[PDB]
Design a protein around this ligand. Structure first.
Ligand SMILES: [Zn+2]
Lengths: 275, 49
């Protein structure tokens, strides 16, 4: 599973940043240490549902003009290989598996079992929220749905559960070959007003903190490290300077490829010899 | 000569807005006088340049 850190960063940042800027309480919590003036100015400009001004995020070298009132700029940076396993072997799988999904699913009644439906089939069930099925419940997964004994659990006929599971792709089996890569990605906020840049950097730090609970980087992009540069004038040739403070984010991910195996043994030929 | 070769243009003088933060020394993001820029402007004066 080749990793595109930049796209993941963008997808995590955009909705999360919009949600954070949606409400004032979270912003006030974030900007507790800042002075009244800059805090209130940033809140007036960008914060709130009905904010007239808006921030943006995008990759570097855009052929079009880019808004320099407040923008998050991303560039890919360097990368390095840090650790390897014997034969480049990372893991072995019997059934092809895709991404790990989290889905909410209300309990349902079936003639012998309570069940939960899901969007897609199941390759493996990791966890059901606040449940530890015993032998009596006889937890079974049958494609799309997971099921447990009806009678002794009948109080929970409409349990508002949620599920963490894994997609199923194929029944084939193979080996995972790959290594670990230690990658650096640079993120910088741009603004002709330095105070806006400072507040933007603080918001960036908070959303990076919040991201650590995300499933994907919990499973794929562990060992997050941060590093901040100095406030510098990005450009001097305009009528007014652009000010930005670059930040460097580090991640560790496992670049890997699935090598299928067609060998399947189903018969044995134990015979003696004579001389 | 200047009135002949020039073009009609509006001249508006510049002055620092009072909205500047007294401690950081940098301006408010939005105010009527200056739209984030730290410098406000006076009423325009019609001029040939
Ligand atoms: Zn002003």
């Amino acid at each position: 599973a080749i990793t595109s850190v930049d796209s993941y960063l963008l997808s995590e940042i955009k909705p999360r940043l919009n949600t954070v800027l949606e409400n004032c309480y979270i912003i006030d919590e974030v900007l507790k240490d800042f002075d009244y003036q800059t805090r209130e100015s940033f809140k007036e400009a960008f914060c709130g549902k009905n904010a007239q001004h808006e921030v943006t995020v995008g990759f570097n070298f855009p052929k079009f003009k880019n808004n320099y009132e407040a923008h998050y700029l991303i560039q890919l940076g360097q990368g390095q290989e840090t650790k390897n396993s014997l034969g480049s072997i990372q893991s072995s799988y019997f059934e092809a598996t895709g991404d790990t999904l989290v889905e909410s699913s209300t309990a349902i009644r079936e003639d012998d079992k309570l069940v939960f439906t899901v969007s897609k089939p199941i390759g493996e069930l990791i966890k059901v929220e606040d449940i530890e099925f015993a032998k009596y419940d006889n937890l079974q997964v049958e494609g799309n749905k997971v099921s447990f004994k009806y009678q002794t659990n009948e109080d929970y006929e409409n349990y508002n559960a949620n599920i963490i599971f894994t997609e199923k792709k194929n029944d084939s089996k193979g080996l995972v070959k790959g290594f670990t890569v230690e990658e650096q990605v640079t993120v910088v906020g741009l603004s002709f007003n330095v105070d806006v840049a400072r507040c933007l950097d603080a918001v960036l730090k908070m959303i990076l903190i919040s991201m650590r609970d995300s499933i994907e980087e919990q499973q794929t992009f562990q060992l997050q490290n941060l590093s901040f540069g100095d406030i510098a004038p990005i450009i001097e040739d305009g009528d007014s300077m652009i000010f930005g403070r670059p930040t460097i984010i580090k991640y560790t991910s496992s670049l890997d490829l699935d090598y299928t195996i067609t060998q399947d043994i189903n018969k044995l030929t134990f015979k003696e010899r004579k001389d | 000569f200047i009135n002949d070769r020039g073009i009609k243009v509006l001249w508006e003088e510049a002055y620092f807005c009072p909205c500047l933060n007294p401690d950081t020394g940098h301006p408010r993001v939005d105010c009527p006088r200056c739209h984030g820029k730290g410098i406000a402007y006076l009423p325009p004066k019609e001029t040939i340049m």
